[PDB]
């Protein structure tokens, strides 16, 4: 058999306004084929104090993104789980399906 990479949103850290909502759209035009087959989809949501960020990338589950080993790296959906960080809100998610990180699931 042979293993092929999957599709993921790849806009990196960008501005966002999706706030106090169930789900939002990463709505970034760039949908990419991950370089490494082992790589999965990852989506970070952050809102420090006076703005909102939104990162979308591929990432090998083996490594920890921002000191957080991808728990649900094999999950179908992008279950927006929470993570505590000093002086900032930190929601992060991951999945193993195509373009899964395009639709966050708070």
């Amino acid at each position: 058999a042979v293993k092929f990479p999957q599709l993921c949103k790849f806009c990196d850290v960008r501005f966002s306004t999706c706030d106090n909502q169930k789900s939002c759209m990463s709505n970034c035009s760039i949908t990419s084929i991950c370089e490494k087959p082992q790589e999965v989809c990852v989506a970070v949501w952050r809102k420090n104090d006076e703005n909102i960020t939104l990162e979308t990338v591929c990432h090998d589950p083996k490594l920890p993104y921002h000191d957080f080993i991808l728990e649900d790296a094999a999950s179908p959906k992008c279950i927006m789980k929470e993570k505590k960080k000093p002086g900032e809100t930190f929601f992060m998610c991951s999945c193993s399906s195509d373009e899964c990180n395009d639709n966050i699931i708070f």
Partner: protein, 112 residues
């Protein structure tokens, strides 16, 4: 012989390039193409009566055959002759990649 110029200006209802638009995400099911989101590929359609852009001798024979034999199920077919590339942009990782997909557009048809 039958080409884009001839059959988009007139209406021969005979073997020639019809018009067709293909939406990658909904027609083909591709989600890996960043741009375009779709393209005009067209297609070939229409009967092939005797001496009507018949490509080869065999086409001439098949036509003449279907002429003396009605509904013989054997007759020249309207199929593309000139295909053309289609430049597309797709992302491999963070890297913006650009390439030409050879033989994606039909500019002419023929009977075979």
């Amino acid at each position: 012989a039958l080409d884009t110029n001839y059959c988009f200006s007139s209406t021969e209802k005979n073997c020639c390039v019809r018009q067709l638009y293909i939406d990658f995400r909904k027609d083909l099911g591709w989600k890996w193409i960043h741009e375009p989101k779709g393209y005009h590929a067209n297609f070939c359609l229409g009967p092939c009566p005797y001496i009507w852009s018949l490509d080869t001798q065999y086409s001439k024979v098949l036509a003449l055959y279907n002429q003396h034999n009605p509904g013989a199920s054997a007759a020249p077919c309207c199929v593309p002759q000139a295909l053309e590339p289609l430049p597309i942009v797709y992302y491999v990782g963070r890297k913006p990649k650009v390439e030409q997909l050879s033989n994606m557009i039909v500019r002419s048809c023929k009977c075979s």
